[PDB]
Structures are given as C-alpha cells and as structure tokens.
Amino acid sequence: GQGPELHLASQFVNEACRALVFGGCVEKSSVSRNPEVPFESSAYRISASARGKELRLILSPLPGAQPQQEPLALVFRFGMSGSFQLVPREELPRHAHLRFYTAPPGPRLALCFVDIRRFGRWDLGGKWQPGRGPCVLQEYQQFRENVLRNLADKAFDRPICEALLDQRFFNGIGNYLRAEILYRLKIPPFEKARSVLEALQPDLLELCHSVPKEVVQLGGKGYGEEDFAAFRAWLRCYGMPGMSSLQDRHGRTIWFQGDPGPLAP
DNA sequence: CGTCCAGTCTAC
DNA sequence: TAGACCTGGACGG
C-alpha cells in the first residue's frame, strides 16, 4: 500500500490486538527470504505505528512473562501486496509469511503479514529506513520543510510526477496518490518538480498531506467489498474513463487530465 | 493456452 | 537506467 494503507493497517493491528495476548514464537513461512524473528514470550501484546510507507510493530511481553525479554520492534514495508489479517489459527491465508499466535484462553487466532507477491520486506532493527523523509500524514511540517530546504537536490530536476514517488521527500506517496494530487491542482505531470515547488518558498505540498488524509477518513480498506466501492467513488483521476496516461521514465503509469507537460517522453 | 497489468532494490 | 523480484486477475485466441 501507500501511506493511507500503511496507516490504516497500523490502526487495524492496534484495535484488533487491543484485548489480545500473544504467546510463543514468531513463525515465518519457509519460502520468505526475510529474516527469522528471534522472539519468544508466554504472554505479549502487539501494537503498531505507521510512518509514510513503513509500519512498526512493537512486541511487548507482559509483567512476568517468560522467557525474560525486552520489547522487540519490527519495521515492515508492504511492497505491492502487503497487508495484516487476524484469522483463526488453522485458516491461515495462502501467503501468510509471518504469524503471531494468540495465547489461551479464547479462540486461537493468528496475526499474519500477508504478501502475495513477496515484494514486502521486514528488518529486525525496528528503525525507520534511513533516507526516507518524514511522513506526509503524521509529520506534515517536517515533511514540508524537508522539501523546501532541498530544492537544489537533482531529484527536483525530474518531472513532478516522478519526484512525487521519491520516498526521500514524499514518504507515503504512491502511484494513485500522485495522480489524485496533481489532478486536484491540474498541474501537468511532466512539469519540472523544481518549477512547481520553487513557487511556494492549498498548494501541492499541502495536498501531499490532505489528499492521503482523505483516504484515511474513508476508513476500512478491509481494516470489505463495500469499503472498496467507497475508495473507487473517491478516485477522480487514477484509472478513470476520460483521463490520459503515460509511462514515467521508470515505467510506472501516471494518470492526468489535459496537458501532459513540458518533459513528456 | 498466451500476454499484460498491478515499489523498491540492485547490478550494469 | 533496465531488469529483477513475485502471484493472480482480466482478457484475448
């Protein structure tokens, strides 16, 4: 997902796991090339926060849990198909690559990282990816300053539609969001990023926050079929009849209305 | 049956 | 910059 999906996922983990207790180890599918999570507690709580296009899980053993353990943090990136599900322990989805098991009593459940295509990754450290900018949703002011302070960077030489996917400056913005954001301001996607940003030192950086916030407010996105209908109705540009599309220089499709802009292939 | 379409990560 | 990493749904023959 993009920032809204990662944020909604962290809300899902927090609400779903609020009154649950996990115990045991953290089980990884054999096909997953991500790392074994070395963690075991008889009793632990799982919580989450999102930052841009990453989600951090905290594994927090209860007072007296055994073996002795300090809380463990994991950072996840979802790639194209990452998600979290709470399922019954013996009805694991097909691509459940990492699982946390509730402890008794009550119905035995599993929190699963589900990633069909396996583009998602996790690391043990618990730290955000060095180089990712601040979260367009939760760190708006830091995000805004981080762009306006570094317009000399060669990243802003590129078309604006390309610059919007550079996670050093737009941590959380993905393909649908770049289309939806430029269509609201009818900024051509192949206008030069520095030209559109230089003129700011509600504008484009504000919509980098407010547009994703709109997606979050829809709620849901399986966090199931009706939630999906609401997102489809919300979209104005991405994939919509009457809209043009081109390939950016990395082969990713940009949707827009009218003028493609000066740097079009 | 086939092609094509849907965010990093890394070797050239 | 170009290809690599993957699976499943749509659609075309």
Author numbering: 2 to 202, 223 to 244, 249 to 290
Please share text taken word for word from the publication where this structure appeared:
Unlike traditional enzymes which are commonly referred to as highly specific biocatalysts, one special feature for hNEIL1 is its unique capability to recognize a wide range of substrates, including formamidopyrimidines, hydantoin lesions, oxidized, and dihydro-modified pyrimidine bases, derived from all four canonical bases. Here, by integrating structural, computational, and biochemical investigations, we show that hNEIL1 uses a triage mechanism to achieve broad specificity and reduce futile repair of normal bases.
While we also crystallized the complex structures for more lesions in this study, we were unable to obtain intact substrates in the active site of hNEIL1, presumably due to the residual glycosylase activity. Hence, we introduced an extra E3Q mutation to the truncated hNEIL1(C∆95 P2G) (see the “Methods” section) and succeeded in the determination of complex structures containing 5-hydroxyuracil (5-OHU), spiroiminodihydantoin 1 (Sp1), (S)-guanidinohydentoin (Gh), dihydrothymine (DHT) and dihydrouracil (DHU), respectively. Despite the very different chemical structures of these substrates, they are recognized similarly by hNEIL1. The damaged bases are fully extruded from the DNA helix and inserted into a relatively loose binding pocket, which allows the accommodation of substrates with varying sizes and shapes. One edge of the flipped base points towards the protein and forms close contact with the side chain of K242. Noteworthy, across all these structures, we observed an unusually short distance (~3.0 Å) between an outwards heterocyclic nitrogen atom of the nucleobases and the terminal nitrogen atom of residue 242.
